Design a protein around this ligand. Structure first.
Ligand SMILES: CC(C)(COP(=O)(O)OP(=O)(O)OC[C@H]1O[C@@H](n2cnc3c(N)ncnc32)[C@H](O)[C@@H]1OP(=O)(O)O)[C@@H](O)C(=O)NCCC(=O)NCCS
Ligand SMILES: CC(C)(COP(=O)(O)OP(=O)(O)OC[C@H]1O[C@@H](n2cnc3c(N)ncnc32)[C@H](O)[C@@H]1OP(=O)(O)O)[C@@H](O)C(=O)NCCC(=O)NCCS
Ligand SMILES: CC(C)(COP(=O)(O)OP(=O)(O)OC[C@H]1O[C@@H](n2cnc3c(N)ncnc32)[C@H](O)[C@@H]1OP(=O)(O)O)[C@@H](O)C(=O)NCCC(=O)NCCS
Ligand SMILES: CC(C)(COP(=O)(O)OP(=O)(O)OC[C@H]1O[C@@H](n2cnc3c(N)ncnc32)[C@H](O)[C@@H]1OP(=O)(O)O)[C@@H](O)C(=O)NCCC(=O)NCCS
Lengths: 398, 398, 402, 399
């Protein structure tokens, strides 16, 4: 009765800087680029793909039905069904977990799933006339802040949440910054050898003169060891701050996508796929909103149990580097310091376009795997939660 | 080992009019009132409920993680996972189907699911500094139009889609107004017989001068039979037009929620439950974006084949009345013109809070079925899709 | 042209529109459209042929979104020829009076024989400010200032409302909550009484507002029947919430929409066309003075003596005083300093009860002052203005010039 | 009781900065304060004698309360100094000087400060209050620069359109306009190579997060590109008949300017030998139909010449604001000033046009070009159909 789901491909766009190369390109347009490549590399006749699920946290001004736009701009048939998913930062992974379910229940044989975000293109919000005062100062919220990084209950940024955790586990400035430098170092190492060449789909942004062709993550080069310890705290300006702009994730523009199928679909069209893998298990989990940084420490045991697997059978972990504070706490709680986490860099140097990051880390994870090895992809999200996915890399199906 | 999933309760707030009673109540607050009533009427201990899935189409300035807010403002534990869903007008019904998938897969035993929408509180968009011109006039889009009711591909209103449907299937102005007059009469007859007292959870509005319990839907009493045939078409003003404000659905604020159950949970805690039912099947289907009004005609026959029944075995049909033209088209294509279709009114008279509408017709449907009878909830969404659910009403499970 | 000796200037006519409430009857009517209504009526009542009027000077504090050259619009909307010259004046609340004094200098120098001066203000229509792309942050909360506060009611140097300036003056000159309230109650009474006898009928130019399906004619001031005597002593201070607060919404002026205008002329023009004019009077003197920005409520105490000295008259020779009632605190401090306690200051009400359309107020008080004087009588219009300043004018009511 | 004369004792201007350039963080009143401070220092008059500050400012949105008060106060002038912000559109700065002159003429004052200021970069967009907003649907937000500064109310078009119509009527062709515009740039460059503007310019110290910048040079006079000039699209009329371009029109800029005026007595006791010493002989304002605002200086000049008792041939240097090349070319035809000394060191096309300061900026530039005893004319047109003209006479001493 219940079947399993296979990843056939993975294609993310280059992660652009805030107010950078993708300011002209809507999140769906980025999404379509990531989709068009992923299908191409999967092998499956498109006709077999039936649904497109895409994460998107900030849908303000994106237009009607963001995920639908991705599907249409990708050249997929109006006949394909779609849905825009919002689990804050877990959105991209969750969209893959849900697309999996259509296959696990036999409802479909091929699905497209991932995430997209253009944080440069998020608007400010001007209330309509019945919610404006008759006179006096009006405060306009950015939307990146209000809907993306502002905790509703404690009424403070996600960076304060990261301070309260960095305090509670005795994580210090100098090891947050060491982790950051390492993030950047690993990202530079990786780009020197062009370790993301195969996984990246290049974005042709046209405008005025002719066409740029963007191929390269923006922000990984830009590390300056000297300044790193001089960097002022970014959220906590009371004396005790530790999280800075250098040791936090950056705001970014980009999109990622994966093609999924049944056993039957893989066997018939995707046996020698670069990305090839089996979705072993997934799991969500929630705790108090403040404690969102460790919510991965609660969602990975579950996914692992559901996997029938232990910490020590997992080759490479890919946690989303939302802060250095975060990774380091989750490393100390799961006892993974001496394990292969974010070998090619993370959100601190590779960027963090919200709705995409869940699926982007998976795409990166699938290209660092030897046949038979177990991969984990985990990602915290605001509100107090995470989702983790256990996958296994394969050369073939049977 | 694919499981069955049961609806155990169904609750909704009153549908308030645009710029009316709920201008100060956010969509998650309204969704939280509807969630509180559904968990109470379910009769299942809160601890077995592990996920909240809520539709919300226009998430702008609602705050981080709208569905999570709903879950928390209703007093569900920080430990319950959540996800905000966007399939436009179909979001609430899709949210139900997703919660079902969890039970159907054995990942949970109880879910809550539905939708919320505050169209009054949808903001205007102000692009950030990098997307504003150096000088000259700037046009701020209203979120209702840009993300809610504007087709991305053809660049016109949803009700131009309705017009191009009414032309194709020869549904005249007179036929459209006749159906709208019937919708209002059915809503008035239902409100006069108090047919919604059981499904409605009142809303407590905290003003300055005391409180206000809102218990009545707003809009359904505003019919003037005289003026209905003299209204000016609201979308097509070139003299060919047919869709008016009267024969179309209004913009409203409201929320709806249902508790879902495994067979085991239903048998142990929901015997005799007023709204008890089994989900027999669910289907999504998509076509050309222009043709989103006739997408139910493509989803309904799919959900009936998965349910193993035919059109003739369903006792009550609940199709969202986005426009009168929408219903009359689908009744013609499906041969349901003499069937029991929206007997207690619909969105023309009872309103249309985008992300709640899909699950609101579900709640309304459950209260009109006799034990052993099949019902069908179908709702079209922007982009060219529709979601349909077949349900079998029960008195007890054996 | 020019002239070797300073000539005399006379006011031939005076008109004002009703003073409407903030966000009230004039939301659809721009300050120059309002100015134009007052202007049309003033030239119509003056008896001088329009070809003789050569310049229009109108006061206007908040000019955002009003369009190019606001005083030029009042002129063209009043039907004056395109050859008449114009200028928009900004001396904050003293704008309307200052425009009169400037229009009188043209006649005093012999450069002109007939002028139009006054002021207009539509506080409902002043907008919010959104800075352009280069002055906005890349991200984060944006604060939109309301032009009323940023450009009209906010001190630049002290960074506080004009009502805090009123607060510090009330303390300095020991003006109590009770005196403030008692003054405001009187203003309301004096206005109600004045309105019951139709005292404003001659000076008021009605406004016709084209609304959706049909026209509405406005000829009555809005806000003067809004006194509830018993609530007065209970109102929360509007600006100072630390316990020392004293100024409230009942004892302070309101924000309003209105316009006022006068025709002025040379002796020769007055003799030929305005001998029995209802409003006919001579501008005897003007004076502007300034002190520290926080002490603006008492700047009129500095302007008045200078104006009186330039007129060769004493306090005791002034029949009716018309001081803008910015706050009750302001009027009482100025009565203290000048020893007017037992004088007739604002007999038919003022700003507290009849409103305060900023740039129109200076010429609105003049218009009201000219309709209350008897032949030969000396009148004084004075008005403080933010930044620390005031302007006073002495006039002499006459039946004829010879 | 007898009308007297007014004298100019000193003049300065800040440098004219480019739109969105060096002065985006410096408000018009701060720019004003720099020019007032320099004019007051160079006048040689004790500061207790100056009693009024009249400053032009056209776009007063978000500048704060009483912009001319701010200018006075930021220059360290005392709070007893009276002030007023004047709005005659582009004539604002010249009209302020005339008004200050009137006080001295009527004997109400012995020393005055007058000039103009504008920060076009800092002009804001206008958002209406809740009672003027539609309850739903698209909202259009006007730029103040367009709505209040450059849009004719009666004809509902840009000032550049008014320029096109004066070009048609006076047969000024795209070629004539470009030649005059090129010429303006070359004069400006010539003047900057000879450091002609050093005596009148008051440097602006712009505070920054990473250091202070001292701006002492006009911005935009090197942007001439003769090649490009004839290949430019019409800026305002795009119906195939347009002749006005960004090249041959004035630019938008930020800047200020200021002069100290005085009575004969004050001039004699403290300003003998002052570089900018001159006598205000006459001033005139004039208006006609709004669309004909570009030819309005032609009505104003004759009146000012008549009141000064001089002929057009008796004026050594003419300073007409170069709002567009077409306006200068049309005014030269009407007045017969084809071979006259007109805008010899350049003008608004190359040197910029900070709306409320231009009127007084051309006067400052004029005063530094005149020989002792020579007559000069400053004239500037303004939106709505008007113009202001001032006749001066350069002096070495008063007697
Ligand atoms: C940090 C953040 C808040 C914005 O930072 P910012 O204010 O734009 O910071 P900048 O990029 O200007 O950098 C600040 C300084 O650090 C320096 N800096 C940047 N990257 C650096 C690096 N790798 N090494 C050293 N210094 C660095 C910058 O050069 C700058 O110095 P400068 O001002 O002298 O130029 C945002 O990027 C962010 O990631 N915040 C949280 C993101 C998020 O999603 N939060 C929750 C996730 S669940
Ligand atoms: C209603 C809507 C179409 C815009 O119309 P509107 O301008 O708000 O119209 P209103 O309802 O305010 O009033 C329109 C007129 O019709 C009248 N009217 C409306 N319903 C009526 C009825 N049942 N009987 C009689 N008269 C009625 C009103 O009284 C009014 O008369 P008036 O113009 O003489 O004052 C708007 O809700 C919209 O944008 N579309 C609906 C949302 C939608 O399309 N959703 C579908 C998503 S799939
Ligand atoms: C003072 C000011 C802020 C008042 O704004 P506001 O709060 O909107 O004023 P309100 O509409 O609240 O004034 C009425 C309020 O006080 C009460 N009130 C006001 N005037 C009253 C009176 N004369 N008698 C009794 N009650 C009165 C009203 O009933 C209401 O109280 P409520 O809320 O309990 O019903 C405003 O008028 C202002 O900014 N102007 C003062 C200064 C100024 O305009 N410029 C200075 C000139 S240089
Ligand atoms: C200020 C103004 C110049 C700005 O217009 P703009 O469109 O930004 O023009 P730019 O300065 O960008 O230049 C336009 C083009 O001409 C070019 N150009 C500008 N000045 C030039 C010059 N002197 N020589 C050659 N080419 C020039 C630019 O490089 C650009 O070409 P590009 O497309 O290759 O970049 C003008 O359009 C304007 O609005 N002026 C208002 C007129 C006014 O002040 N009225 C006052 C009435 S009294």
């Amino acid at each position: 009765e219940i079947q399993e789901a296979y990843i056939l491909s993975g294609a993310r766009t280059p992660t652009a800087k805030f107010n950078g190369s993708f300011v002209s390109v809507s999140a769906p347009e980025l999404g379509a680029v990531a989709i068009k490549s992923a299908v191409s590399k999967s092998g499956v006749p498109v006709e077999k793909i039936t649904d497109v699920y895409m994460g998107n946290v900030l849908q303000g001004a994106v237009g009607q039905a963001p995920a639908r736009q991705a599907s249409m701009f990708a050249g997929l048939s109006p006949t394909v069904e779609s849905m825009t998913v919002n689990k804050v930062c877990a959105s991209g992974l969750k969209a893959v977990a849900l697309a999996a379910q259509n296959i696990q229940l036999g409802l479909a044989e091929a699905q497209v799933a991932g995430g997209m975000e253009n944080m440069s293109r998020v608007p400010y919000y001007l209330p309509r006339s019945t919610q404006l005062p008759p006179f006096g100062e009006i405060k306009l919220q950015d939307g990146l802040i209000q809907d993306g990084l502002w905790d509703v209950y404690n009424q403070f940024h996600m960076g304060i949440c990261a301070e309260k955790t960095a305090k509670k586990y005795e994580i210090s400035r100098e090891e947050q910054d060491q982790y950051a430098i390492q993030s950047y170092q690993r990202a530079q190492a990786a780009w020197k050898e062009n370790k993301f060449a195969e996984e990246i789909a290049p974005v042709t942004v046209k405008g005025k003169k002719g066409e740029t062709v963007v191929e390269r993550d923006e922000g990984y080069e830009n590390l300056r060891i000297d300044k790193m310890a001089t960097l002022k705290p970014a959220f906590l300006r009371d004396g005790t701050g530790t999280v800075t702009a250098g040791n936090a994730s950056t705001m970014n523009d980009g999109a990622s996508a994966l093609v999924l199928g049944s056993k039957a679909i893989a066997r018939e069209f995707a046996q020698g796929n670069r990305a090839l893998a089996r979705i072993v298990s997934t799991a969500d989990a929630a705790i108090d909103p403040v404690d969102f940084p460790v919510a991965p420490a609660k969602a990975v045991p579950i996914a692992l149990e559901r996997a029938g697997i232990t910490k020590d059978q997992v080759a490479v972990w890919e946690f989303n580097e939302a802060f250095a504070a975060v990774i380091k706490a989750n490393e100390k709680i799961l006892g993974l310091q001496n394990a292969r986490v974010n070998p090619l860099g993370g959100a601190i140097s590779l960027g963090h376009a919200l709705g995409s990051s869940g699926s982007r880390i998976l795409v990166t994870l699938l290209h660092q795997l030897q046949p038979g090895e177990y991969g984990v992809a985990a990602i915290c999200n605001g509100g107090g939660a995470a989702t983790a996915m256990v996958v296994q890399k394969l050369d073939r199906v049977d």
